[PDB]
Fold:
Amino acid sequence: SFIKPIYQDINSILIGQKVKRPKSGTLSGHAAGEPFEKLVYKFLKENLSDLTFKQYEYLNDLFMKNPAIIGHEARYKLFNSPTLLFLLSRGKAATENWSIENLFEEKQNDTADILLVKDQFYELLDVKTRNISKSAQAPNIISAYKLAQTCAKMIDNKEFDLFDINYLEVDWELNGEDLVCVSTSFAELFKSEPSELYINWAAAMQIQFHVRDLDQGFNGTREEWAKSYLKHFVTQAEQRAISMIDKFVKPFKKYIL
Amino acid sequence: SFIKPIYQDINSILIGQKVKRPKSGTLSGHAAGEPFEKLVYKFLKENLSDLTFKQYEYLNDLFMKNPAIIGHEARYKLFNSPTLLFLLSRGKAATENWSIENLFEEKQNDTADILLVKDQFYELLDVKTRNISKSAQAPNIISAYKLAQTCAKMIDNKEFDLFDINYLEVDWELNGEDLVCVSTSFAELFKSEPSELYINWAAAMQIQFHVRDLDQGFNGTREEWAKSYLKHFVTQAEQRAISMIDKFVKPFKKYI
DNA sequence: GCCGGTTAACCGG
DNA sequence: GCCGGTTAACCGG
Ligand code: NA
Structure:
């Protein structure tokens, strides 16, 4: 984690900072804390200037630093890693259509919010925003299915010391016409017990939890974390399939006749 | 539908409308073309003032004209219909603590953007907005499971002529730092072939379709539409119970 | 004290 | 045409 070292600095520049609210009034999903992410990234881009990238930004740099190679297959080789391609690359069509005149942009799908890279090591930072004027449910963190596939590809290629998936929670509350941050939390996904990750099937097969309450006591290796996750995943998928019937089938049998 | 009769007028007024790019960050989910919904509502209040209501606004006016009521239990009775209570009402604690000095505000999982009410008949209007400059996937229309519960409720309480769930799509495209409505469309859920609605399980069990493409040729009587929907839904759930093994399970067993 | 469903709307390594 | 995952973050008829 290239972030944990200067965490307090982050937490100190964020708490207290007021940012005028979005000219809409919703403050639901994407249209909420969003500007806090911008703040975090801006700080990092100035205090880790060379390690800090926006996912699409990293991709635009990757291809720009290799103008000699065109086509999608040659560009997919620029990742020198399957898992990394899975986690960060754009589609076949898009990858092939990229150019200095047609650069990549933000994409609702992008696995990460900001990218920190140094020494062929990658930190996938996803910043979560939370309105603490409510006591809502744990937000979507990452797709269980995506993580499952990511683990399977760590095992296949044997890439166990290449990337960390970390989370930064930014708590806020409305105050006048502004949103103001009241506190933050940090957590390393691969530092938590995988067998305990809660997967919310209906919620886009996403595992959900508040960064603030996530356990960080895992002791095995990254190879053992992945195995355990795939285990929990299959177990809970088998479980969901059976649980679905008891809730979405039987309760309505008395109508179909 | 109270909108359909005036639809040509709303399409006319919408096409050409512009709204400021909601935020510096790209427009996804709640941060997309939502502002246009405020324009639809505006037009409706302006031409159907006695019928046009925000969902929370309707609940606020309901409890408001019943000052003697008090208490969630007594207040739920005000709905005079179970199926409407299930689709519109708020939490028990939210209902209990309601007061003119503590009104309902919009909630994220409401159900409907706009409520057109008249003569005990309820039209639930949902506005879908879409970035037409690209070809994206059908958007989340409504929860398949929530629909099943409503159908189950309609059938049990035999209330088949109480409400309609309609949809308005308003397409836009980026013009500088403004979003401009370029097209529009409208369809009625209950006029569609229930057995053909696509249920996207992973995507919050949401049926998804582009409004402009929805089929409007159902024949039957609202009850058939419901019986036909529960049928399709259960079948899809069974199916989904299987497919979740061909994926998620069978292909990951190779690992421990 | 637990457990999970719903709004919004996105392309395809 | 058809099919279907993901990001965001929400409380409790
Ligand atoms: Na809407």
